[PDB]
Amino acid sequence: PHRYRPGTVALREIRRYQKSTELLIRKLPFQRLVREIAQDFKTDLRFQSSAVMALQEACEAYLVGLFEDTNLCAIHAKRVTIMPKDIQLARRIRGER
Amino acid sequence: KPHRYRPGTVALREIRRYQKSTELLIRKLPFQRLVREIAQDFKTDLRFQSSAVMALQEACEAYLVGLFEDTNLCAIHAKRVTIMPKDIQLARRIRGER
Amino acid sequence: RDNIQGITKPAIRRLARRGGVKRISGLIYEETRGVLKVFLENVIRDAVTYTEHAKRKTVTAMDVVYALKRQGRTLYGFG
Amino acid sequence: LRDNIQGITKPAIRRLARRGGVKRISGLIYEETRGVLKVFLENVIRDAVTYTEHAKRKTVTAMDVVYALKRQGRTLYGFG
Amino acid sequence: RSRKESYSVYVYKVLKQVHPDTGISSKAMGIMNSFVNDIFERIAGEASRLAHYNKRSTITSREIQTAVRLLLPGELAKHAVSEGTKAVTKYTSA
Amino acid sequence: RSRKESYSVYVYKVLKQVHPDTGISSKAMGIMNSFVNDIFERIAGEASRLAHYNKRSTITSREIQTAVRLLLPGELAKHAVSEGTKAVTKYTSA
């Protein structure tokens, strides 16, 4: 049968999701996370629909900005694979940890 | 017999030496000629207070010592102990300066 | 609980694709959803203390936007 | 004034690197640190002179430096 | 039925002087409203400190020249001062 | 011969209630003056926005409880509100 060698579907997905503007986390399991991170500050809080979509445009902008920084840490160590050494380095240099 | 410490050991005792003090590590007169050389690109015949040059003094070593902390962890992450000028360029791009 | 698991392995993997990531080690998917929830615990606890100050019970869209701006993460498109 | 960036000598960059815990230093680190620091001084003095001539005085005061560092997000205590 | 203000009238006039056969979305107009509000409070926030540092009580155009030179980078500050002094010069002549 | 204000009188009173046999330098007092001025303008700067966001014109103690809870981290904000409400409670009783 036909078979792509490993590294060619991964590059067309980098080309795919850098062309779009969609939200990459599903909508409903992200609303259920927000509603339980906010339940230990006040009980029975309510949310606008544009207040949860404001949190998701910010969390995906934070993580995509983190994975650009964590990719330059793996290239710097002569790898191409990300591993959580690289995340923990990029968190430290930006003053987050 | 001529006595020599191994390469590395007086490097550690003057990491301990300057992390214990507060002295200004750049010599003061060549730094003051540098500030006045850079400042001529914006206005001619400027004057400086003595404490305005010493405020630029204190700010620049704090920027560099904080940068040499960040560039050291970029070199240990790449599995070496020598900082190379590709490590400064990584530390200055993750923070958002370049 | 069990809601942090809803940010799935292919959802993190395609956020990594927008950042340019070629291949992912398997111990990242429990790493980033720990990084994500630390981020939301800082934005929401400033969002919901804007609702208490305004004596509201709902979290408006401006309360997320004002909470993000004071973390240096300003957002355009919601007010 | 001219050729003052080499007043920041090779043992002065080394003593700055060892307050930051650096054990071994490559020889090409010195020409970049002359350039990294010169970029940083060209941004603080550029703002500090802007605060002086707004107030119409020929002397760059210490408060002009403290204000110019504060608007870059590097607040300095000890000068006012 | 409250009346709320935006800059969407004025952004759409500047767009028709630059690209007269180009439109804009609603979501892209809400971003251009967020842009103008943000740059307003940066410049008015910095000019508020320049007047306070020199113990003045008036924000003039000279506290806004300096706040433009502090905030806007490089050549983008150089054209914005040229666009600013020209509007004040035309205003005092009329 | 102008008279310039600092917090050096008040820092030296708090030091003698915490460490009554300990002094301070002049350079360390100029840092504690820079600390109090900085934390003042963070809290008064955040309370200025809380009053503006809710379309109020008064900064009360309730806009300073919220600005303390926003700015000070963790347990350091929890003792500072306890120290704040107790001073307002003692003030209204006297």
Added chain:
Amino acid sequence: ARAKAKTRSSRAGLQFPVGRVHRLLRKGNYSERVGAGAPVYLAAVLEYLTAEILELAGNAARDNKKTRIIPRHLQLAIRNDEELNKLLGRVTIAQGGVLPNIQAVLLPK
């Protein structure tokens, strides 16, 4: 019977309002009093910066063969220009996406 009312934005030849910006300065708690040339100066700086973005965002829309500027074209306009990228380096634009760059180590050869 006085005169026809001329806007202050037409005395300076501007499109952004001078009278609204003058009110927002005087009611925004910035100073005790506001000069008369201060909203004229500020409404011209705000008009230049929107004219700078809408020129670049209008170019990115015709390169994608569209006649309406969506927030993708505002993202591409700002992150490609080097001066607007530094003015707006800490700013997230909603529904803007990123710019396509693959690191050259990852490309196969």
Added chain:
Amino acid sequence: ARAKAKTRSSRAGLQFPVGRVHRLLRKGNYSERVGAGAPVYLAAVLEYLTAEILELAGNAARDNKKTRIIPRHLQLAIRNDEELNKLLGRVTIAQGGVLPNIQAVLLPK
């Protein structure tokens, strides 16, 4: 013949001034008007944070066997406490130095 003047800092039992903080709020361009409990609340928060640092800086001075707090002891007080380090994480203290830490890879074994 009215009454002896009592300071507002003594009505609340504080050492930081309430009357000075009330003036700096009302002349600092923060709002149109300032509540009466607002400088009382703010001068108590400022007094707690200086009492928190001078307690930790006084401990670092007796650990170095000195009786005067120099700016080294203020640096050691802030960067060792975890809550003051995050409040003051973007702040340079002049003549403060750093904290001694060598990375464990660099130590010889």
Added chain:
DNA sequence: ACAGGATGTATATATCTGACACGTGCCTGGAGACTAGGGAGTAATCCCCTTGGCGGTTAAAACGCGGGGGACAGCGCGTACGTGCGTTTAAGCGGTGCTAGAGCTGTCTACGACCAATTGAGCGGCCTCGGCACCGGGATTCTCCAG
């Protein structure tokens, strides 16, 4: 290097929907003209502080010679992550309904700006003596070569 096949991907045409662009009517925020009080611009003066210069001391910088530890290229071995297929799994839609809380209006009351006359807290200057900085000296710790 090279040709064919196969699987994604750009090009082009057709159609529908709904969101932009526009028009219209009303309201309230901006502009007109005016008045008066204080902010700030201008002038004069004073003296702090900044620049410039000079000579003696010596610390720190520059140079240079060994040589050894570490960077770095190369290799091989074995996990582990990518690709793909089949099978569950709930997300997404849309439709319906309920109502909690946002938002608005219209009271009035307590709170804060404002004023003025009064006084004590805080500030600048002026001294004194003790913390502490440094120099001399002997002792403890610690690195490293040979055993």
Added chain:
DNA sequence: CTGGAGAATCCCGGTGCCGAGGCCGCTCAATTGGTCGTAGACAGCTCTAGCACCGCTTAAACGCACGTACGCGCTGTCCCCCGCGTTTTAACCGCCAAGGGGATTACTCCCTAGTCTCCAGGCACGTGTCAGATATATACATCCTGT
């Protein structure tokens, strides 16, 4: 690995010098005691939109497998950096001295707040059509085995 050698930091103790601390005028900013108007509290009411539900479709997550390319360890070689001695340079010090410009105090005038009145610019609301999203089928470009 197991001890003497030698270098460096350490703890001690004594002598001088100055910066902290505590003092004393005196000026001015905080205080006290009233008064006046409006900001914000509280009540009532509207109706938006947030939460909850069920059902059906199917896109997307899940699980399993296979094999390949990557991470990682080991090894070896060269050369670059570190430690140290010698010589050179200029930072550092203290002192001398002119004068530029910061930091005041007066004085006046003109610019901005404030006010009343008039009115058009810009907001909300409809309303229809064209940009564009979606489908469907191409040619085209690209990866990959076998060559």
